[PDB]
Design an enzyme around this catalytic site. Structure first.
Site, mmCIF file in Angstrom:
data_model
loop_
_atom_site.group_PDB
_atom_site.id
_atom_site.type_symbol
_atom_site.label_atom_id
_atom_site.label_comp_id
_atom_site.label_asym_id
_atom_site.label_seq_id
_atom_site.Cartn_x
_atom_site.Cartn_y
_atom_site.Cartn_z
ATOM 1 N N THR A 159 0.779 -1.249 0.000
ATOM 2 C CA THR A 159 0.000 0.000 0.000
ATOM 3 C C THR A 159 0.818 1.311 0.000
ATOM 4 O OG1 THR A 159 -2.024 -1.020 0.853
ATOM 5 C CG2 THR A 159 -1.818 1.352 1.135
ATOM 6 N N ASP A 308 -3.962 0.594 -6.088
ATOM 7 C CA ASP A 308 -2.555 0.541 -5.701
ATOM 8 C C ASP A 308 -1.875 -0.803 -6.016
ATOM 9 O OD1 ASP A 308 -3.921 -0.669 -3.626
ATOM 10 O OD2 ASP A 308 -2.682 0.255 -2.044
ATOM 11 N N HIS A 309 -2.602 -1.910 -5.863
ATOM 12 C CA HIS A 309 -2.058 -3.275 -6.104
ATOM 13 C C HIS A 309 -3.187 -4.290 -6.153
ATOM 14 C CE1 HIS A 309 -2.945 -3.879 -1.925
ATOM 15 N NE2 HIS A 309 -2.185 -2.846 -1.622
ATOM 16 N N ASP A 683 27.401 -1.070 -13.312
ATOM 17 C CA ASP A 683 26.654 -0.409 -12.258
ATOM 18 C C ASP A 683 27.040 -0.954 -10.893
ATOM 19 O OD1 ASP A 683 24.872 1.317 -11.067
ATOM 20 O OD2 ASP A 683 23.126 0.036 -11.401
ATOM 21 N N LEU A 689 21.959 3.522 -12.752
ATOM 22 C CA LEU A 689 22.470 4.456 -13.763
ATOM 23 C C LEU A 689 23.896 4.074 -14.130
ATOM 24 C CD1 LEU A 689 21.445 7.660 -11.742
ATOM 25 C CD2 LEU A 689 20.089 6.653 -13.600
HETATM 26 C C1 LIG Z 1 14.404 8.263 -10.896
HETATM 27 O O1 LIG Z 1 14.280 9.671 -10.860
HETATM 28 C C2 LIG Z 1 14.971 10.316 -9.805
HETATM 29 C C3 LIG Z 1 14.636 11.808 -9.800
HETATM 30 O O2 LIG Z 1 14.952 12.333 -11.068
HETATM 31 C C4 LIG Z 1 16.480 10.061 -9.932
HETATM 32 O O3 LIG Z 1 17.098 10.419 -8.727
HETATM 33 C C5 LIG Z 1 17.921 11.588 -8.804
HETATM 34 O O4 LIG Z 1 19.233 11.255 -9.218
HETATM 35 C C6 LIG Z 1 20.269 12.228 -9.054
HETATM 36 C C7 LIG Z 1 21.603 11.517 -9.297
HETATM 37 O O5 LIG Z 1 21.834 10.571 -8.267
HETATM 38 C C8 LIG Z 1 20.268 12.971 -7.692
HETATM 39 O O6 LIG Z 1 21.058 14.139 -7.831
HETATM 40 C C9 LIG Z 1 21.875 14.509 -6.697
HETATM 41 O O7 LIG Z 1 21.196 15.479 -5.916
HETATM 42 C C10 LIG Z 1 21.917 16.022 -4.824
HETATM 43 C C11 LIG Z 1 20.973 16.859 -3.967
HETATM 44 O O8 LIG Z 1 20.087 15.954 -3.336
HETATM 45 C C12 LIG Z 1 19.029 16.571 -2.563
HETATM 46 O O9 LIG Z 1 18.223 17.471 -3.322
HETATM 47 C C13 LIG Z 1 17.299 16.893 -4.249
HETATM 48 C C14 LIG Z 1 16.574 18.030 -4.979
HETATM 49 O O10 LIG Z 1 15.482 18.556 -4.251
HETATM 50 C C15 LIG Z 1 16.363 15.894 -3.538
HETATM 51 O O11 LIG Z 1 15.505 15.246 -4.454
HETATM 52 C C16 LIG Z 1 17.162 14.835 -2.770
HETATM 53 O O12 LIG Z 1 16.265 13.952 -2.098
HETATM 54 C C17 LIG Z 1 16.912 12.726 -1.662
HETATM 55 O O13 LIG Z 1 17.423 12.803 -0.338
HETATM 56 C C18 LIG Z 1 16.451 12.989 0.690
HETATM 57 C C19 LIG Z 1 17.155 13.074 2.046
HETATM 58 O O14 LIG Z 1 18.378 12.361 2.006
HETATM 59 C C20 LIG Z 1 15.382 11.886 0.679
HETATM 60 O O15 LIG Z 1 14.309 12.248 1.525
HETATM 61 C C21 LIG Z 1 14.857 11.611 -0.738
HETATM 62 O O16 LIG Z 1 14.057 10.441 -0.730
HETATM 63 C C22 LIG Z 1 16.003 11.489 -1.757
HETATM 64 O O17 LIG Z 1 16.756 10.308 -1.473
HETATM 65 C C23 LIG Z 1 17.167 9.565 -2.648
HETATM 66 O O18 LIG Z 1 18.305 10.121 -3.290
HETATM 67 C C24 LIG Z 1 19.508 10.074 -2.534
HETATM 68 C C25 LIG Z 1 20.578 10.942 -3.212
HETATM 69 O O19 LIG Z 1 20.093 12.257 -3.425
HETATM 70 C C26 LIG Z 1 19.906 8.603 -2.361
HETATM 71 O O20 LIG Z 1 21.083 8.467 -1.596
HETATM 72 C C27 LIG Z 1 18.776 7.819 -1.681
HETATM 73 O O21 LIG Z 1 19.052 6.432 -1.747
HETATM 74 C C28 LIG Z 1 17.401 8.082 -2.303
HETATM 75 O O22 LIG Z 1 17.255 7.267 -3.452
HETATM 76 C C29 LIG Z 1 18.173 15.525 -1.833
HETATM 77 O O23 LIG Z 1 17.516 16.126 -0.736
HETATM 78 C C30 LIG Z 1 23.095 16.813 -5.374
HETATM 79 O O24 LIG Z 1 23.829 17.426 -4.335
HETATM 80 C C31 LIG Z 1 23.983 15.853 -6.160
HETATM 81 O O25 LIG Z 1 25.042 16.592 -6.744
HETATM 82 C C32 LIG Z 1 26.324 15.950 -6.536
HETATM 83 O O26 LIG Z 1 26.583 14.843 -7.391
HETATM 84 C C33 LIG Z 1 26.611 15.111 -8.793
HETATM 85 C C34 LIG Z 1 27.294 13.947 -9.505
HETATM 86 O O27 LIG Z 1 28.609 13.818 -9.003
HETATM 87 C C35 LIG Z 1 27.266 16.442 -9.230
HETATM 88 O O28 LIG Z 1 26.478 17.017 -10.261
HETATM 89 C C36 LIG Z 1 27.518 17.488 -8.123
HETATM 90 O O29 LIG Z 1 28.774 18.079 -8.369
HETATM 91 C C37 LIG Z 1 27.466 16.962 -6.679
HETATM 92 O O30 LIG Z 1 28.721 16.391 -6.313
HETATM 93 C C38 LIG Z 1 28.880 16.275 -4.872
HETATM 94 O O31 LIG Z 1 28.514 15.015 -4.339
HETATM 95 C C39 LIG Z 1 29.151 13.928 -4.993
HETATM 96 C C40 LIG Z 1 28.605 12.612 -4.445
HETATM 97 O O32 LIG Z 1 28.839 12.549 -3.050
HETATM 98 C C41 LIG Z 1 30.685 13.998 -4.896
HETATM 99 O O33 LIG Z 1 31.253 13.318 -6.002
HETATM 100 C C42 LIG Z 1 31.287 15.413 -4.827
HETATM 101 O O34 LIG Z 1 32.369 15.365 -3.914
HETATM 102 C C43 LIG Z 1 30.320 16.545 -4.430
HETATM 103 O O35 LIG Z 1 30.320 16.704 -3.025
HETATM 104 C C44 LIG Z 1 23.179 15.103 -7.236
HETATM 105 O O36 LIG Z 1 22.888 15.968 -8.321
HETATM 106 C C45 LIG Z 1 18.846 13.375 -7.305
HETATM 107 O O37 LIG Z 1 18.828 13.879 -5.992
HETATM 108 C C46 LIG Z 1 17.907 12.177 -7.387
HETATM 109 N N1 LIG Z 1 16.562 12.536 -6.952
HETATM 110 C C47 LIG Z 1 15.764 11.756 -6.206
HETATM 111 C C48 LIG Z 1 14.412 12.319 -5.882
HETATM 112 O O38 LIG Z 1 16.064 10.637 -5.790
HETATM 113 C C49 LIG Z 1 16.735 8.560 -10.071
HETATM 114 O O39 LIG Z 1 18.082 8.330 -10.373
HETATM 115 C C50 LIG Z 1 15.865 7.915 -11.134
HETATM 116 N N2 LIG Z 1 16.113 6.482 -11.136
HETATM 117 C C51 LIG Z 1 16.506 5.834 -12.240
HETATM 118 C C52 LIG Z 1 16.763 4.360 -12.127
HETATM 119 O O40 LIG Z 1 16.648 6.393 -13.319
HETATM 120 CA CA LIG Z 2 25.473 3.485 -11.356
HETATM 121 ZN ZN LIG Z 3 -3.006 -1.191 -0.686
HETATM 122 ZN ZN LIG Z 4 -3.481 -4.799 2.010
#
Ligand SMILES: *[C@@H]1O[C@H](CO)[C@@H](O[C@@H]2O[C@H](CO)[C@@H](O[C@@H]3O[C@H](CO[C@H]4O[C@H](CO)[C@@H](O)[C@H](O[C@H]5O[C@H](CO)[C@@H](O)[C@H](O)[C@@H]5O[C@H]5O[C@H](CO)[C@@H](O)[C@H](O)[C@@H]5O)[C@@H]4O)[C@@H](O)[C@H](O[C@H]4O[C@H](CO)[C@@H](O)[C@H](O)[C@@H]4O[C@H]4O[C@H](CO)[C@@H](O)[C@H](O)[C@@H]4O)[C@@H]3O)[C@H](O)[C@H]2NC(C)=O)[C@H](O)[C@H]1NC(C)=O
Ligand SMILES: [Ca+2]
Ligand SMILES: [Zn+2]
Ligand SMILES: [Zn+2]
Ligand SMILES: CC(C)(C)OC(=O)N1CCN2C(=O)c3cc(-c4ccc(Cl)cc4F)ccc3NC(=O)[C@H]2C1
Ligand SMILES: [Cl-]
Length: 806
Positions: A159, A308-309, A683, A689
């Site tokens: 759910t 949902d499912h 990966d 990715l």
């Molecule tokens: C499906 O779609 C989604 C959405 O499009 C794809 O996910 C995106 O992928 C991006 C690449 O991984 C990622 O971008 C990073 O964002 C960083 C900022 O993150 C915060 O801000 C965003 C924007 O509002 C927000 O969405 C994030 O939310 C996450 O975190 C919170 C709290 O932790 C959670 O509540 C939330 O659920 C979410 O978690 C998820 O994502 C995190 C990572 O963000 C995972 O760890 C979790 O498991 C979970 O899945 C954040 O609040 C930004 O700072 C990054 O920028 C760094 O990295 C890049 C590449 O190197 C670069 O451009 C920059 O220079 C910078 O470098 C710095 O960090 C590097 C790594 O440590 C390091 O090399 C350097 O030293 C630097 O310090 C980066 O751009 C984006 O956030 C997510 N979005 C979401 C919503 O998940 C997803 O990939 C798709 N899936 C598929 C299969 O295609």
């Molecule tokens: Ca990867």
């Molecule tokens: Zn349900």
């Molecule tokens: Zn149920």
């Protein structure tokens, strides 16, 4: 404390959250212990029922009533939904013949068609045909609007993970709600259906529909309803809101039903006690539709009916227990049920070894009703790895079954005959989608699609710009009468090189041998043209894939195949070839079994060597275009070039060789020729990715040759199979996979038998969408076809499940 003793008078179900410690009058106040003293009194009236009766028509307005049948009622926007039927001799909405809605028919003030989401829990996809006799309203929506035969949930098919994926267009791994039960090791806190932790906003990531609307100046109804609020109240509340003045009135609304999931848990998906819950839901849809007809909105509002499912037959006796597998059962914690998740019981023990845990759970019983995985080795189509809240050890449980820790957890922690949460391609888990309105099509059936795709669509319908998500915007354009979104191909980042012959044999010292010395005026200009691309439109039927990142790569042409060769990774990114139905399999001749040849188009420095594979006992090699399928003994020499070579574990060579020597030809037989594109995937960090050059964690011992984590293939042919793959005039058909590249076959319990009893079962399990492969390679396929691009984006989201008809 909360000083909650102001009034709710005039504020019943207000849309804002007022500052504490005041009292609130909205759905969350019950959950927060913040309602006003009179909330129940004023905001939850029940007097005289939910329907008008002939002896109420034009009555004296008594404010205490649940709803009204008076003359001023339409003006006040609070009649019982059948007020027109009884009092004014108007017919029910189900009773009218549906008439195409060619343009929105909206009352003044209404700038755009509203969207009402009517979400139903545990609504199994087969219910639409099987319950069709007792659901006349739902059946009308289905038959007159736009419907899929079913809609695919996300894994785990629970759910909370599914509701918030519907809300965001994100995989659970991205939005953070990875189950109904969760432990975050950084929060050191647990998330459960019961209790208060779930109320903190730190669990919920991404950006849901109602936030996206708010931030862009579109007002939203509630998406949370108290369980205690009856469904009739929920509807009248939504209808009251639609009556509000223009600048106060929300554009997007939600209704949620706990049924038929709550009953399906007790009675199973088809229990005889399921007929009444389906009767209930259809009445509520009746009430909403009569309600919209009253206020002239039934040819103006877009309605989405969505689940949902699904729901499967599950009972206590079908429980596998871990204590029957493991001696040390008290040093683990398990998240149990239709899916299993294991972590150490205490962080203190560094003796805890996931490998020993996994070894004890592997093929130990011939009957075994679950299979253990390290999360990184789960099928990539489940996208269930990249979050700290997903435990390293996962159990995929058989449909109709459960896993638990010990027997005491089952009888003191039988009351149920249904459950859900299994693998998302399982038929019993599939759910429903119907779209009805001006913006949807008329009497239209569409192919099944995934629920991650609806976020983009609901944004279109509301004129919003979707926050970044996992749908593929444009892929569901065929559901709509008119589209806000015109999708366009990403631009190629890296143009290829086209190397000619530039190096002599003796410049190479690769440690490779081949028997190729023994070999014309006729045939020299023949095979010249093959290296120049004369048969390019035979083996590459939909354009070269586009490379969407900055790299350095070469196109290489051959008689039988064509490849995209990476100077960075020293191996191809993609290899493309067409096997016609007529083509024949042949063997690797005795003298050519060890044959690897230098490629005179590519430099020793940007080439693999035989010496590293000699040094590495763990690591052999395979080939991307298969020698077995060479068009002629002369052509076969091309298959042995060092630039067609890929690293492969012996164990994996078994799966690969059987794919290349048996399955490819068989597909060609069934599908009237096939075109195959195969390549490696890297990966290591399981985010789904592609990994960059400086994220490689594994090399063939002592070389710079990186080791793929997976190997993919895309297999395309003509949907009308009377036409050969390479001469197809219309729509295409595709299937794909992403094989994990593993040093053992421990995943296939039957692997010690002949490859014909297991290999195909393995590939089926790791089926994939082209779009999953694109994320993992940074490539972009199907650039050059005769098909519209919306049709191509649909093709790319397609998943071949190998399930039988629902
Ligand atoms: C499906 O779609 C989604 C959405 O499009 C794809 O996910 C995106 O992928 C991006 C690449 O991984 C990622 O971008 C990073 O964002 C960083 C900022 O993150 C915060 O801000 C965003 C924007 O509002 C927000 O969405 C994030 O939310 C996450 O975190 C919170 C709290 O932790 C959670 O509540 C939330 O659920 C979410 O978690 C998820 O994502 C995190 C990572 O963000 C995972 O760890 C979790 O498991 C979970 O899945 C954040 O609040 C930004 O700072 C990054 O920028 C760094 O990295 C890049 C590449 O190197 C670069 O451009 C920059 O220079 C910078 O470098 C710095 O960090 C590097 C790594 O440590 C390091 O090399 C350097 O030293 C630097 O310090 C980066 O751009 C984006 O956030 C997510 N979005 C979401 C919503 O998940 C997803 O990939 C798709 N899936 C598929 C299969 O295609
Ligand atoms: Ca990867
Ligand atoms: Zn349900
Ligand atoms: Zn149920
Ligand atoms: C109450 C608390 C637990 C604090 O969280 C909340 O209020 N949420 C948590 C997140 N959420 C949801 O994802 C949610 C989604 C839907 C939904 C259904 C279908 C479609 Cl096409 C789009 C949707 F959006 C329906 C009902 C629902 N139910 C909730 O409860 C709300 C608000
Ligand atoms: Cl769970």
């Amino acid at each position: 404390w909360t000083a909650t003793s102001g009034s709710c008078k005039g504020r019943c179900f207000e849309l804002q959250e007022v500052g504490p410690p005041d009292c609130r009058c909205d759905n969350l106040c019950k959950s927060y212990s913040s309602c006003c003293h009179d909330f129940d009194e004023l905001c939850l009236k029940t007097a005289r029922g939910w329907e008008c009766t002939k002896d109420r028509c034009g009555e004296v307005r008594n404010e205490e009533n649940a709803c009204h049948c008076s003359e001023d009622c339409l003006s006040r926007g609070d009649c019982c939904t059948n007020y027109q039927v009884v009092c004014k001799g108007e017919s029910h909405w189900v009773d009218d013949d549906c008439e195409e809605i060619k343009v929105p028919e909206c009352p003044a003030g209404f700038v755009r068609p509203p969207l009402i989401i009517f979400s139903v829990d545990g609504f199994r996809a087969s219910y639409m045909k099987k319950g069709s006799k007792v659901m006349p309203n739902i059946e009308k929506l289905r038959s007159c609007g736009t419907h899929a035969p079913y809609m695919r949930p996300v894994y785990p098919t629970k759910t909370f993970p599914n509701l918030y994926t519907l809300a965001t267009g994100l995989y659970p791994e991205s939005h953070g709600i990875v189950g109904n039960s969760m432990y975050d090791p950084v929060f050191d806190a647990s998330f459960h259906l019961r209790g208060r932790e779930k109320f903190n906003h730190r669990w919920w990531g991404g950006q849901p529909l109602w936030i996206t609307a708010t931030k862009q100046g579109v007002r939203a109804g509630t998406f949370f309803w108290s369980v205690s609020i009856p469904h009739e109240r929920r509807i009248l509340t939504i209808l009251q809101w639609l009556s509000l003045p223009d600048n106060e009135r929300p554009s997007v609304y939600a209704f949620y039903s706990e049924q038929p999931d709550f009953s399906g848990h007790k009675y199973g998906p088809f229990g005889p006690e399921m007929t009444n819950p389906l009767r209930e839901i259809d009445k509520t849809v009746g009430q909403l539709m009569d309600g919209l007809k009253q206020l002239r909105l039934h040819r103006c509002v877009n309605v989405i009916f969505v689940g949902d499912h699904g729901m499967e037959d599950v009972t206590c006796d079908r429980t596998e227990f871990l204590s029957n597998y493991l001696t040390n059962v008290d040093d683990i914690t398990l998240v149990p049920g239709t899916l299993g998740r294991i972590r150490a019981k205490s962080i203190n023990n560094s003796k805890y070894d996931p490998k020993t845990i996994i070894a004890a759970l592997t093929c130990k019983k011939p009957d075994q009703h679950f299979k253990p995985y390290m999360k990184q080795h789960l099928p990539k189509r489940l996208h269930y790895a990249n979050n700290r809240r997903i435990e390293d050890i996962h159990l995929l449980v058989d449909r109709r079954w459960h896993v638990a820790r010990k027997p005491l957890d089952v009888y003191k922690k039988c009351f149920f005959q249904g459950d859900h949460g299994f693998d998302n391609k399982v038929n019993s888990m599939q759910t429903v989608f119907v779209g009805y309105g001006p913006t949807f099509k008329y009497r239209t059936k569409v192919p099944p699609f995934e629920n991650i795709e609806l976020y983009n669509v609901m944004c279109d319908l509301l004129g919003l710009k979707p926050a970044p998500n996992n749908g593929t915007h444009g892929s569901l354009n065929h559901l709509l009468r008119t589209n806000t979104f015109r999708p366009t191909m990403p631009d190629e980042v890296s143009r290829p090189n086209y190397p000619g012959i530039m190096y002599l044999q003796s410049e190479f010292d690769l440690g490779c041998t081949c028997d190729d010395k023994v070999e014309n005026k006729l045939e020299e200009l023949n095979k010249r043209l093959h290296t120049k691309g004369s048969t390019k439109e035979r083996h590459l039927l939909y354009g070269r894939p586009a490379v969407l990142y900055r790299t350095s790569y070469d196109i290489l042409y051959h008689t039988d195949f064509e490849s995209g060769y990476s100077e960075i990774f020293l191996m191809p990114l993609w290899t493309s070839y067409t096997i016609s139905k007529q083509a024949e399999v042949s063997s690797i001749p005795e003298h050519l079994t060890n044959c690897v040849r230098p490629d005179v188009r590519v430099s020793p420095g940007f080439s693999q060597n035989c010496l590293a594979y000699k040094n590495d006992k763990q690591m052999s090699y395979g080939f991307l275009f298969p020698p077995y399928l060479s068009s002629s003994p002369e052509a076969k020499y091309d298959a042995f070039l060092v630039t067609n070579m890929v690293p492969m574990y012996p164990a994996f060579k078994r799966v690969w060789a059987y794919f290349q020597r048996v399955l490819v030809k068989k597909y060609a037989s069934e599908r009237n020729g096939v075109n195959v594109i195969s390549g490696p995937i890297f990966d290591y960090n399981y985010d789904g990715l592609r990994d960059t050059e400086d994220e490689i964690k594994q090399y063939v011992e002592g070389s710079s040759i990186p080791v793929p984590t997976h190997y993919y293939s895309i297999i395309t042919s003509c949907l009308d199979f009377t036409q050969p793959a390479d001469k197809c005039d219309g729509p295409l058909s595709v299937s794909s996979f992403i094989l994990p590249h593993r040093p053992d076959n421990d995943e296939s319990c039957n692997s010690s038998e002949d490859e014909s009893k297991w290999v195909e079962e393995l590939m089926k399990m790791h089926t994939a969408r082209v779009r999953d492969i694109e994320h993992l390679t940074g490539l972009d396929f199907y650039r050059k076809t005769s098909r519209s691009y919306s049709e191509i984006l649909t093709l790319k989201t397609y998943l071949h499940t190998y399930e039988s008809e629902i």
